[PDB]
Amino acid sequence: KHICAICGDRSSGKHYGVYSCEGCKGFFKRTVRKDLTYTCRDNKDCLIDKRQRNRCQYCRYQKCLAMGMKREAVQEERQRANEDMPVERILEAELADPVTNICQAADKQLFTLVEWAKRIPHFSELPLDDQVILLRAGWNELLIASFSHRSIAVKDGILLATGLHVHRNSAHSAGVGAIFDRVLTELVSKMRDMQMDKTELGCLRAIVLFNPDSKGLSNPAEVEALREKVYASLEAYCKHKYPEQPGRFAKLLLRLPALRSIGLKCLEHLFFFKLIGDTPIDTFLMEML
């Protein structure tokens, strides 16, 4: 004895939390099931009538939300070795004015990386399109993780692969002593006091590589999938290589936040030194930015 709170038709009862017609009921259902995303051509003010309800999907679904049509009430459609990521291979691939000093290195290592990447299992097999999207996203983090590890021995600085230290006071001079020190204690201080296994550093950089959230993926799943493997291979590698350290896998993953945080605050400076024209930069770097 009711009417659809959305358009006016004869509601056949309550559907997903409101009185409504088979029409609106079923429309709300597919939008949810399929995860469609509508848009309004005109100005999100389209009237929803028993006659012109199919006039605009965006404004229609939006009214459903207004009359409180709970999307969560819609149910799921009623149908349907640990070395799949050879830890070995990973380790193998893993074997291959200061602001300028830095940059001159970044570039050198920017070409190397690709080699490292192509040498990571499954990676290459991915759609060339995705291979780019991927490298574009984490190159920042990737590079920091590497040199951050190489600097385990040094005292108050970092190495660049081309054998040139860069101690604290020196970065402070360039006016980057903070982000710098952050690198020193949120990464180096940590990795060192943990004797970070190269293989482990291998897996981490790989997990960083396989970021399924990067925008523009021909298939996120494939990537989530790939990363999840490394979670296994790496979990196993730890289960074995370090039986006395229960939560090593955990404390090893908890390195990632610090890395992203710093990585972000790093592109901060880059874009800045760039536009400013501050010191010379190289072609590959410019491409990334």
Partner: peptide, 9 residues
């Protein structure tokens, strides 16, 4: 480019 190029093989 510089990357797409290098990632062409």
């Amino acid at each position: 480019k510089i990357l797409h190029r290098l990632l062409q093989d």
